[model samples]
Target chain A: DIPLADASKPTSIVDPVTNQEVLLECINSGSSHSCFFEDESIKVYKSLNTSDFAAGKLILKPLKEKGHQFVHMDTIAFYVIRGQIITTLHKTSYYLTSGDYFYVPAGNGYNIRNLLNEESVLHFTQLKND
Target chain B: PLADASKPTSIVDPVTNQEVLLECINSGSSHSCFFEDESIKVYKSLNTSDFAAGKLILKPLKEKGHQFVHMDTIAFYVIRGQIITTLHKTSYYLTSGDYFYVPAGNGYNIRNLLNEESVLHFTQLKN
Candidate 1:
């Protein structure tokens, strides 16, 4: 059954964590910026999370340092919006630039490295296991 | 168990004619158009049992069809330009790098009122 969405109320909400305006509110909707994490070379702006999937943006700052290595229980997709990135999966690296899209299947250890002097922005989504 | 189709592959953007990488989870023709018009277009990426991804482009001053709701959850990330995402009666302005999500059964519509075109990336989860 579909739940009723009231149009009379505010369509945006103030994200307590990032202090940004997030649109829409629902059971699976994230009411705010959702999540944010950063370190010396990267900034993550996570926007939404649901039982079925999660979506967010990853910003890789200019860096020559090593990248993070991780594995997911489900498939993850990436779409580059700015700069260039080297995505290493299963020991093979793919050099991707803006307008590029790729995916890392579940259980594959992958690392994303930005060797540019500028930041690299990528939109990513992770599908959850059933 | 996962099939070889779950592995990585690249597809060319039909409009731009540029090669873009994508994964094929369920490859039945491997292409689907969510919506397309002279002013707006959507390019599908992957459609799996659980989720799907795509790209949306809207020309300047283009307005999507009437307010509608989805049976599944959807999220959008603005890749370029500015636009307004209206949920119900209220509209929220979004620009490059902005991200927004809409749950199932939420009345919504998107419009690009600026002189520049707007590009958005989207992902939807099946209910």
Candidate 2:
């Protein structure tokens, strides 16, 4: 279970594998991002680029935290289906509620954090270009 | 400029048009096919077809608060974030978990209401 904090600033959680800084952000209805964390160990999944469709889903499990590094690809949209998460980008922090939505530009750097303190899940889809 | 839906059939390119149509659809997990501007868009909850399948065609006006008209119907889903739309002289707001059907030949405009980019899954049907 993740511990709750004031959330006004970045929360430091050392990655067990890389021992890097993992920041957390709490979001509200007006939040702009889904979630953000500061761990580079999590690799960006690139297998979807070759697919025929412009959409795919990423299931983030509980007790499992993943980070995504931005890349130059199609537009990406994220929705929190079951759990809570945090996203940080452009030097701003955002929390994703059950129905919150967020989009990432083609080439921007951002991060996501599962902050349910128990288990969490997230759904991600990419938008294809015309 | 909006188009006049009341007319049986009208063809006004940009000026002197004042009609729009907005349709709502059900949210589900399966891939469903629909028509937009006589084009086809296949929609799934967390998946969509490739750009070769279709592209998101948005017409932005140069004026500060001007809205664009849709020559064809547009199918869109709010994946995340809030979207503010101006349709049929009325304003509609949508968030994640919401889906909408924009009829063909309607004057409408959509914008992201928050700082974060609004992620929408939509397709412009190909002729």
Candidate 3:
């Protein structure tokens, strides 16, 4: 039987692909830099496969104020819900915020940094049209 | 300019609201849908801002018999885990970084395959 969650538990996720662990915090109303999906849990869906298109949430915190480098993207299709992000693609610095979107083709790298105190968060989706 | 967006894109520094519920998707969260058209009804987050972008959900059905009745074209973003869905008798096995579309029908059900629950950020589309 599928049981209901504790509800009091926080949201957590592991980036199995990155060989990294990500704790997505769920309910922090006042923390500007909070994660929609937070916490720590066992690696999820070991049976799941990483295909051409998938969806996941992200919470970006400060990286020594210099921002962070975001790579390993199938595409540049992401929806920004809270806060903002700065990245340079094709020799141009691009800034994105809430309700904004961008798509960069595969290749090269995107140097990304959060621009606000609230941890910049986004739901990234990979698109496939075949 | 930040390049290509319907509106010029820029990072704004400010505080916002929770209507985006964009809130937290939990096991206790309920999934609601509305009629965008006569033939299409979209299942969206009941908790959303007037200006909320879309309905993204965190699914918590880790059992074998979870179900979702499809009323419209549902676009599911599988954040984590795998699912086996049957709609109109057609079967779909989906995993992370995967896109699964369930066409509008009466009996589109979803199930979580293992002990671990699969999460999804889903929205509705009309036909």
Candidate 4:
């Protein structure tokens, strides 16, 4: 299992009903936020609540963490900003360095190991398949 | 990319034929135009997926601004420094942790108003 906590829940910028942009401080900044949206198919956490797809960021300290698992999904993407991380998938381990990207198809689960000294920031992008 | 991944307007039929696609990219580098420094292009043109996301790195600049208007609904979240974004006739000073959503048609002009570098992780949801 992984950790779950955020500053605030974000709302979807795209209107799922109309598919139009919801204008009103959508861009306005700061004051941390995290929004989680779900359906019978999958669940996502992002800067906003969106049935439109795309999930958001995941920050992991430089530690041994039991990555993430996707049962109702196919693929996931990881973008590293600051430090390095290890991703084990399909019996293959990937050493993702700073400013690196790694993509892995869904399976039983993936384990992320941080061997670096400093804290690392990574963004995770996933989609809700219909 | 506009012709490939984005539609200039809305679509009537919600259901359409979809395809699985793929493309190989190297890494992040300097772009040809503007005040931006470099970009780690995760997705270029809906390559293998229905959506695309990438990092827009903006270095310190005192001249010129990037005015972008397109058909895709693009969301920009500041992962680094401060960026001054002008959209919908107003200006928003966005720093790290700030997010901005620019839908199709209504364009925006972005500038790095800080001396330090700034990074924006953005994803476009194409209709």
Candidate 5:
């Protein structure tokens, strides 16, 4: 069973684009993580109730040519949401298309870059503790 | 409290995209779905009590490549897996830090060609 956090005073993060503070709260029933994003910029923040729960972010920078990067406190899985991203794991590069899914074991060093010229988005979650 | 193998199993369409065959009955249950890709088919099982009572399966067909069939309303949140999905023939690929959803009543499919297993979690919404 998972413990529910207080919703009346939920936790939140601020978006850099809209400069709006958004709250991240887990649903009292079922499984879900609280997160939000904007169309203008490529920055996302997910809520983590405990230290064991890993935090993740997606960045789309055309100038820097930066790809998607995943950081986890433990073992988890990742899926592509939109656009094309080249994932580098164990010095091997794999081209991920839409509807494809892959897993990254615990403590693995990997990087994902968007191959497109436009901004991209990704969604992730941690479930080892659960 | 007992087993009944002679009883006729019933197939139920829990959602819009696929069909379900109830092979067993018990309080604690695990549900699985099968999907087709190009050459490989995958069966995914999810804990019903933990979230929603649903699962996913993938079948790899030679002509259509990979296809996904889901049995419930789920929202997929990607944390570290890479995936490519075709929703109504629209291509959208994701990496370690990407996430999306397969709404109820929409026909969607997924494929995991990465050398590693793709990890993801979802929220099962009640009807």
Candidate 6:
């Protein structure tokens, strides 16, 4: 049986990369952080994780001029929680609004940026190869 | 740079070279409810590929008709309101922005104790 704990008390930590204040909070169950900011460009919240699968939320900072670009070995799906932004996969860009869903296939390079001045929250899930 | 002024706003699948589009169901969207009846309603986030994601609307003072179990891993992120997630013999009180993960083969039930409706987003990964 899991013990009941209050997970909403938010604490602050300075992001090493951007030197910005990042808030940390725990979800009701599972690992260290249920929700927290990673850096200036990324905010993450864990939803679920197993040996084979992992899922979480990603929030892009408002007025982010620089896009986060990377590639993954497995397919990554994204569900926009709110705000409008643009995502680029395979060097092609697409504008996405809240409630939009899309995925970047494995072995493809992608970029995400919030063009607006408001925070963009998105849900993402990917399979783990290891 | 990913954004360019000259390129049009559109989404396309690179493999098939065809445009891809999906509808939005957020509160701000035109059609916010994806499924609705007397007891409950749903707002979809993602239901394609191996992932099933969406917001489940629990009406006031309602509970799941019965306990259910999943063969794969699933998670719930509290979007609005508070509810109790009873798994096996333990129950957890979760509120907005809170999250809980349920592994495979675990039977769980949820209920809304408040007078107003509650919302929680579910993300499930299929084997």
Best by lDDT: 1
Tell me how far the alpha carbon of residue B73 in candidate 3 is from the true structure, in angstroms, after superposition.
11
Better of 2 and 5 by DockQ: 5
User: Fraction of the real A/B interface contacts present in each candidate?
Assistant: 0.09, 0.00, 0.05, 0.17, 0.00, 0.17
Per-residue lDDT for B1-127 in model 1, tens only? Answer: 1224335644334346465555533233345556789778888866666777878888889887544545666788887877767654456666776676775665667888688779889887786
Identify the candidate with maximal DockQ: 6
lDDT for B5 (candidate 6): 22
lDDT of each: 0.66, 0.41, 0.41, 0.52, 0.43, 0.62
Best-to-worst order by DockQ is 6, 4, 1, 3, 5, 2
Please write out the lDDT profile of model 5 over residues B1-127, one tens digit for every residue. Answer: 1233222123223243233333221112223555554434334433333233222322221222433434333455544445565443344555443445443334555565465556554544333
lDDT of 3 at A94: 58
Q: What digit string (tens of lDDT, one per residue) describes model 4 on residues B1-127?
A: 1111111212112133222222212134322223332422222322334455566766665322555556666777778876566664555566786766775566566677677667777666666
The clash count for each model shown is 0, 22, 12, 5, 54, 0
Q: What are the per-residue Cα lDDT tens digits for candidate 6 across A66-94?
A: 35455455667777778788777655666
Native-to-model Cα distance after best TM-score fit, residue A113 in candidate 4, in Å: 1.7
The model with the greatest TM-score is: 1
TM-score of chain A of each: 0.72, 0.52, 0.50, 0.62, 0.54, 0.68
DockQ for candidate 5: 0.03
Per-candidate chain B TM: 0.71, 0.46, 0.46, 0.60, 0.46, 0.69
Q: CA shift at A95, candidate 4, in angstroms?
A: 0.6
Which residue runs of candidate 4 sit more than 4 Å off their true CA positions? A1-25, A35-45, A105-109, B1-49, B62-69
For model 4, how does the per-residue alpha-carbon lDDT over A1-130 read when each residue is reduced to its tens digit?
A: 1122222333234444575756444543344345754432223347543454444666565464645554344455556666666665434455556655545433334556667755666666565555
| C-alpha lDDT (0 to 100) for residue A104 of candidate 3 | 40
- Worst 10-residue lDDT window for candidate 2 chain A reads A24-33
Q: After best superposition, candidate 1 residue B102: deviation in angstroms? A: 1.7
lDDT of 6 at A95: 69
- TM-score, one value per model: 0.71, 0.34, 0.38, 0.62, 0.38, 0.69
TM-score of chain B of 5: 0.46
Per-residue accuracy of model 3 over A8-122 as CA lDDT, tens digit each: 2332333334634444322211112212333221111111113323344555664313333343423434455566676554445655566444444343244556777656656
